[PDB]
């Protein structure tokens, strides 16, 4: 499912090296971190990003991802 | 063959971690990781980018691709 | 807790692989790689970072860190 | 020797994971895993590389070269 | 101590996988490979670098940097 939709508002390096990115007043983390310098980028730029997965209430995980 | 070319429309992270773009309205994903930053580099500048594979077909992998 | 708050005034690559950087006047180094990287193009972009660790005077170690 | 000099016109991402750049009108290609996003970001931003190898035609390989 | 400092007025990539940078006329290398990107980046930018080592004479080995 389609959870947020948006800029990157902030995102954050996580001790247990996790990444954790704000869209859509909603935060999502993943521990897949080839998407760490991705989202970065995008956060930049102001890509929109299209957080997707299975569980989209806010502080759930996330590994799949479209960039617009 | 070269089976697309023009700017990134897209691009995708997928959850087998495969990166997907979309070139000339076909999609094409590629499992070669040390492609992603450069494919959304591209994406993001504006880059002319060049898909080729054996199989041009929408929804077809490759691993060989032509920045201009 | 919320070590310091603002841009990175500089940072510095070590010599035992560790990486070093001075936000709000306090010094704050990692042994996280994959945080090099993207605490230098916070940097180079100028954002605003918040280093989060346990210790926060000057010369503490961190893993934890947000991107504004 | 001084093979090349001058910005790079085009790259691509070879199916035997060689990395190929044309400088100068001529295409040179390397082994060398860390050159990658080097080139790149020479290509991105338009810097002058200069191709040194011992072997100048078109359609060498290299391993050293500078970023000017 | 604190060897040069100033812009990186060009770079290269050897064929040792030892990279070179030459700041205030004087020329260093490192075998840091995790270096390479974030030293070009510093050129291609145009930051301050300091080369921080034990022997400061032109042709010396570093590992230590500070960015400004």
């Given at each position: 499912?389609?959870?947020?939709?948006?800029?990157?508002?902030?995102?954050?390096?996580?001790?247990?090296?996790?990444?954790?990115?704000?869209?859509?007043?909603?935060?999502?983390?993943?521990?897949?971190?080839?998407?760490?310098?991705?989202?970065?980028?995008?956060?930049?730029?102001?890509?929109?990003?299209?957080?997707i997965?299975?569980?989209?209430?806010?502080?759930?995980?996330?590994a799949e991802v479209?960039?617009?």
């Amino acid at each position: 499912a389609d959870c947020a939709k948006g800029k990157i508002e902030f995102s954050k390096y996580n001790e247990d090296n996790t990444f954790t990115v704000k869209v859509s007043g909603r935060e999502y983390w993943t521990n897949r971190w080839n998407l760490q310098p991705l989202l970065q980028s995008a956060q930049l730029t102001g890509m929109t990003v299209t957080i997707i997965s299975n569980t989209c209430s806010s502080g759930s995980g996330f590994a799949e991802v479209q960039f617009n």
